[PDB]
Symmetry: D2
Subunit: 345 residues, 4 copies
C-alpha cells in the first residue's frame, strides 16, 4: 500500500491557528454583523446590494491591508446603499502550472510551506475583520475552511466543484452564506441542484478543529445563492437575468442572483468589468430587485504581472488574473450605490 | 463565529483500526496485486484482453453481494483468456441532489448513519471478495474513506460529477490502483483529459493519514489513468464518438484508449439498453478497434430497481441494473468480440 | 530549545486498534465482569473466600502461559467454594535486562512494542475467554488503555505507590487495585495511596483514540494493601495485627493481601511454602482480615538466564506440584476458618 | 471500559500553546544560557552556586511577576557568585489530596480549567524568561512537560517519584539538567539509581507535541544530580554530605549535591531555612566544593494561608507550604554569595 505516496509531513491543527490568532471582539462583531446583513438581503428584508470586491488572489499582505483601508472608507460612505465585503482569496485554481497561492506557497518560490501560509492567511483575515471590514473567501477543499471560515462573512464554492457532493456537504455546514457558480456553458441546473443539496442536513466525514477525522452532522444551509459568471457568451444582461429568475422560480427557490463582472462576463478583459457594471446598474436603477449581489476583481494597481524567479514585483498589482485598479474601483462602487438609490427612489 | 450549522460531531475509528481488525490475507493481497498488474499491462497495450468492470450500481446487502461474487468469479475463471473481470463493489454514491449515499454512510439505510458499522461491514465484504480471488472496483467520492479500503481495490473510478475536482485529481495521483475518469455529465471530454494529465503529476496537499490525523502529503503521480465514456446529452459509445475521443487523446499526447460505460446516459437511463450498447461495442471490438480496453456494466442478481418495508432480494436500490441471465450472456458476447479482434 | 535528547519518534497503534482487532468475546467479558464483582464482595466483607493471585513472575512465552492457564483453571473450578483464583499475567519485571513481553516480545532488544501489545492483548483475551480471570501490574499510564478491560485485579508497582500520577490512574481503573507497603515494611505510603485513589481526580491522560485529553475519575473504593515485607518478612500474625490497627486508625477496612514472594520469602522461592503454612495457620485459626494472597508460580520451578520451557526467565517461582499443594492448603484453611 | 471514568474533555495540544506563546529571542537566550551555565557547574568548570529559589507554588501571575523582578535584580547583582533561577512550580504532589496547582485548577475553585491553566502557565513562564530570569520546575505529570519544557532551565523530580521508571525515562529525554530528590525516608540510593537510569537511553510510550501517543527514543541525560531534602532527620550537615559524596563516588558519579533548605531539612518550619543557610554557608566558605546548588522556598510575604476558608487571599503569600518572605530572601542570597566568594578565596 501507499506506493504513490512519497512523504507525509506534519500539519498544524486548526486549533493551533485559532489559539495563535483568535478573533478579536471587533473581528467577531464584523463577521457576525456582515453575515446577518447578508442574510437580511437574501431574505428580501433589505434592498441594499452585496458587493464582493477585491483581488483575484492575495499574494502580499501589505498591499492587501492598504487595499482594505481604502475599501473600508468606501464601505462606510456607501453603507446606506451597499454591503461591501472584501474579496480575500488565496489561490487561483488553474489547469496549467503556476503559483499555488498564498497558503501553499506564501514565499512564492515554488516550494510548499503550508504551515507558514496558513499562519499568514489567518493573520491577514484577522487584521481585515479587526479593522471593521468583512471578508469573503473561496472554498476549494474540505480541510482549509477549519482554519479560516470563522473569519468569513460570505464564501463561494469553486466553479469546478459546484457539482461535487463533498463540496455541497461542506456548504451545508458553513456558518456563512454561500454562492454557487453556474455551469461553464452558462446553464443553472447544476447550481440549482447545489443550492438544494446544501440547504439539506448532511452526515459525513470531516476533519475537526483538533486535526482529527470525525463524523459530522450539519443543519443545512439556507443562505445559498447562484453566481452568474457567463458561459461561452456573457450572461449578465436583462435577458439572461430574466431566464435565470424563471429557472429559480420553477425550482421553488428565491429568484435572486449575484453577478460576477469578471472573466467570461467581461470576455477576460479586465476593463470590461466597467461595461458589465454599466449594464447591471441600468437594470438595478430601472427596478431590478433580483440582483442581490455582484463580484468584481479589483486591486490597488490595475492589470497583472507575471511572477519571475529572482526578480521583485510591482506593488499592489495582481500576479494572477488582471484586475481593475483603484480609480476604476472607486467609480464602479459609486455607480452601483447610485443605482441602488435610483431603484427605490 | 463557529459551528452554528454543525449539529453534532462523533467519534470515528481510524483506518489503522480497520486495517488491524481486517488485514489482507495472502490470497486477498495476491488478487489485488495481480489484477492491478494485469490492468496496467492492458493499459500499456501489452495485453489484448478486455477489462470488464461489472456489478451492482451500489452494494447494500453483503449476502446478495457475496452470492453475486460467487457467480461472477466462475465466469472470470471461464473467460480469463478474453476478459479481465473485476466486480463493481460501490460503497459510495454521488447523488444528483440528496439520497442514500451508500453502505458506508448508512449501512442500515434508516438515516442512522452508523458509519463506523458501515466501514467494518464494507471492509469485511471487500476482504472476503478479494480472498475468494475476485478483484474489486469502487468509486472514490469521499476524501476520507479511501484509507480504509484502497489496499483492497484493484481499480477506481472518479465520478462524472467530480472529474473536474482538484481534490479528486490529487487523490487519484496518490492511489495505488489504476483510475478511470468519467466524461462530464454534459458529455464534455476535455475535463476528463485534464483530469488524466493532472493525476499523472505529483502533488502536495492536505489529506488524512492512517491514524486519522490531517497532514501534508506528497504524491508521486499516477500514470495508469484513463477516460470512461458515459454519454452526455446523447450516447457517446459509437465508433464515431470513439474516433473523436481517440483523436482528442492523441492531441493531448495521451494514449488513445477508452473504457466504455454501457449504462447511465449511454443507455438513456434504461437498463435493458445496456444490451444494445453491448451489441454495438462488440461490433467495434470484433471489427478491430484496439482502443477499447475496457467496459463498465451495471449488473445485479435480479434486474431493475426498487425504492427504499423490507426489500426484494438481489435488486438494486439505486440505478436499474441488468439481471444475472443477461449478464452471463453480455459477458460471453464480450469475450467472443475479443476472440474476433485477436484472430 | 526542544528535543535535544529525543532521538527518534515512531508511530504507536492507538488502543481502539487493539480493541477492534481483539475484542472481548462474550465469555471473556463475563469472566472479567464476574471476577471483579466477586473480589468486590470479598473486599466489602460479604464473602469469606480468599482471593488468590498466582502465576509467573513475568510472561515471556505465550504457549507456556496458556498451558499454565489450563492447569490453573482446573484448580480454580475445583476450589471455587474456598478460593477466588486469578492468574497473574505480568508482562514485565521492574528492575534497575530484558524489558518484558510488551517491549521486547522477541527477546532480542528490538523494542517491537506494537507487536508486544498485540501479543499481550491476545494472550489476555484467550485466558479470559477460557474462563480464567487475570491480574495485571500497572507500571505506566499508557499501557492500561490497551489491556485494562481484560483485567479483574491489578497491582500498582512497588516503586510507584507514592506517585500521585499512579494514584490518579488507580482512581479511574474499573478493577480492584492493590498497593504494596514500603520497602522498610511501613504501611503509611500505602494508606495514603488508598485514600488518594478513593477520591475523584481530574488529570491529563491518553484516550482509546491515542490522543491526550482531560479525564475526570470517580475514585476507586476497591483498593487494599499488599504486604510484601520490608527488611524482615511482615506476614506473621504479629505484623498482621499491627497493620490492622493502622488501617483501623486510618479509618480504613482492616484487610490485607499477603505476597508470599521476595522479601516475605527472603528471596528463596520454596520459602513461599513456609509463608503458606504460617498464613494458613492464621486463616484456619480465624484471621478474617487476610482477604488475599499473591504467589509466584510456574510450570517448572526455579529460574534461568538469557532456554528451558515453562521456567521463569526472571525471579524464581515454585513449580507446578508445589502450586497444587499450596492451593489445596489455602482452600483447607478457608474451610477451617468458615466452619 | 469507562466504569470509573466520569468525563473526558478536549485538551489543547502542545503545538497550540507553542504557537500562541512562542519563545522570544531573549527568552530563548535566557534558557540557552542558564542551561549551559548549569552544565558547566555540574562538569566542575565553574565555582558558582546554582540557586533555585521562589514560591512553593505559583497561584497568582501578578505576584509571580513582582517576585521575578525583585529576584532578577539580585540575579544581576550577585551573578559573579550565584546562578539564580526562579522556582516557577505549576504542579504540586500532595501527600494524599489537595489543590494540585495552577495548571490543574487555575481558578482555585475545583473547576479544573486545565486549558486555561496551560495558557496562564506558559504565558507567565514566557514573561519571566523574556525579562531575563531563568525558571525551574518540578516535572510531575507525564503530559504537561511538552507544554513548558522549552522554557525551563532546570527541573526536579520530586521525592515521591524519584523511584518511578516513567519519571526516570522522562528525565533521560529532557533538554534541561534535572535534580533527583532523595527518598522521603532519607534514602540516598534511590536518587543515585535515578541518576544512572536517566543517563541512559530509553525507549518508551509518551505523547508528542501534537497530543498523540507514540513510541519515543531518548539519548540519556548526563546533567543529573541529587537533591538532599532530609529524611526522618535533616541531611544537610557536613556529616551527611560526606556520606553522600562517598556514595556517589562509589557508584562512579561525581561527588556533587544540591541542598534543599526546606521541607524535611527545615522540619517544615519555614524560618529554619535561614538556619540551614547558616550551616551550608559555613560549609561552602570553609571549602566544600561538592555543594553546587541549593533550593529555597521564598515568596514576597512570609508564611502561608488557607484556600479552604473562603477568605479572599492575601497578596504575595503562599497557599501551599510556608515560605520565607522577601527581606529574609535578600539576606539569604547575600549570605550565599558571600560564602561562594569566600570558597573561591
Ligand atoms: O456508479 C456510477 O457509475 C455512477 C454514479 C451513479 O450511480 C449515481 O450515484 C446515481 O445515478 C445517483 O442517482 P440520483 O440521480 O438519484 O442521485 N455514475 O454516474
Ligand atoms: O516543591 C517541592 O520542592 C516539593 C513538593 C512539596 O512542595 C509538596 O507538593 C507539598 O509539601 C505537599 O503538601 P501536602 O503534604 O500538604 O500535600 N518537595 O517535596
Ligand atoms: O489550502 C490547502 C489546499 O490547497 C489546494 O490547492 C489543494 O487542492 C487542497 O488539496 C488543499 O491542500
Ligand atoms: O509582553 C508585554 C508584557 O506586558 C506586561 O505588562 C504584562 O504583565 C506581561 O504579561 C506582558 O504582556
Ligand atoms: O508497556 C510499555 C511501558 O513499558 C515500560 O517498561 C515503560 O517504563 C513505560 O514507559 C511503557 O513504555
Amino acid at each position: 500500500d501507499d506506493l504513490r505516496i512519497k512523504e507525509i509531513k506534519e500539519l498544524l491543527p486548526p486549533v493551533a491557528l485559532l489559539e495563535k490568532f483568535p478573533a478579536t471582539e471587533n473581528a467577531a462583531n464584523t463577521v457576525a454583523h456582515a453575515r446577518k446583513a447578508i442574510h437580511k438581503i437574501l431574505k428580501g428584508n433589505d434592498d441594499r446590494l452585496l458587493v464582493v470586491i477585491g483581488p483575484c488572489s492575495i499574494h502580499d499582505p501589505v498591499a492587501a491591508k492598504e487595499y482594505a483601508t481604502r475599501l473600508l472608507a468606501l464601505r462606510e460612505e456607501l453603507k446606506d446603499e451597499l454591503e461591501i465585503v472584501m474579496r480575500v482569496y488565496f489561490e487561483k485554481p488553474r489547469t496549467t502550472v503556476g503559483w499555488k497561492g498564498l497558503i501553499n506557497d506564501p514565499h512564492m518560490d515554488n516550494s510548499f510551506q503550508i504551515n507558514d501560509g496558513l499562519r499568514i492567511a489567518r493573520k491577514l483575515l484577522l487584521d481585515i475583520n479587526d479593522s471593521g471590514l468583512p471578508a469573503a473567501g473561496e472554498f476549494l477543499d474540505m480541510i482549509t475552511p477549519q482554519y479560516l471560515a470563522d473569519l468569513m462573512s460570505w464564501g463561494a464554492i469553486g466553479a469546478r466543484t459546484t457539482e461535487s457532493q463533498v463540496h455541497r456537504e461542506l456548504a451545508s455546514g458553513l456558518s456563512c452564506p454561500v454562492g454557487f457558480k453556474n455551469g461553464t456553458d452558462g446553464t443553472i441546473k447544476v447550481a440549482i441542484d447545489a443550492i438544494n443539496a446544501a440547504g439539506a442536513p448532511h452526515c459525513f466525514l470531516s476533519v475537526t478543529k483538533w486535526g482529527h477525522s470525525a463524523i459530522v452532522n450539519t443543519s443545512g444551509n439556507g443562505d445559498c445563492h447562484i453566481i452568474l459568471r457567463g458561459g461561452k457568451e456573457p450572461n449578465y444582461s436583462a435577458k439572461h437575468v430574466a431566464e435565470v429568475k424563471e429557472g429559480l422560480n420553477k425550482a421553488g427557490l428565491p429568484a435572486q442572483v449575484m453577478i460576477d463582472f469578471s472573466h467570461a462576463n467581461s470576455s477576460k478583459q479586465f476593463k470590461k468589468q466597467m461595461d458589465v457594471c454599466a449594464d447591471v446598474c441600468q437594470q438595478i436603477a430601472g427596478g431590478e430587485k433580483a440582483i442581490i449581489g455582484v463580484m468584481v476583481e479589483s486591486h490597488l494597481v490595475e492589470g497583472n504581472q507575471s511572477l519571475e524567479s529572482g526578480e521583485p514585483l510591482a506593488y499592489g498589482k495582481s500576479i494572477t488574473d488582471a484586475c481593475i485598479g483603484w480609480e476604476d474601483t472607486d467609480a464602479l462602487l459609486r455607480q452601483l450605490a447610485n443605482a441602488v438609490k435610483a431603484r427605490r427612489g
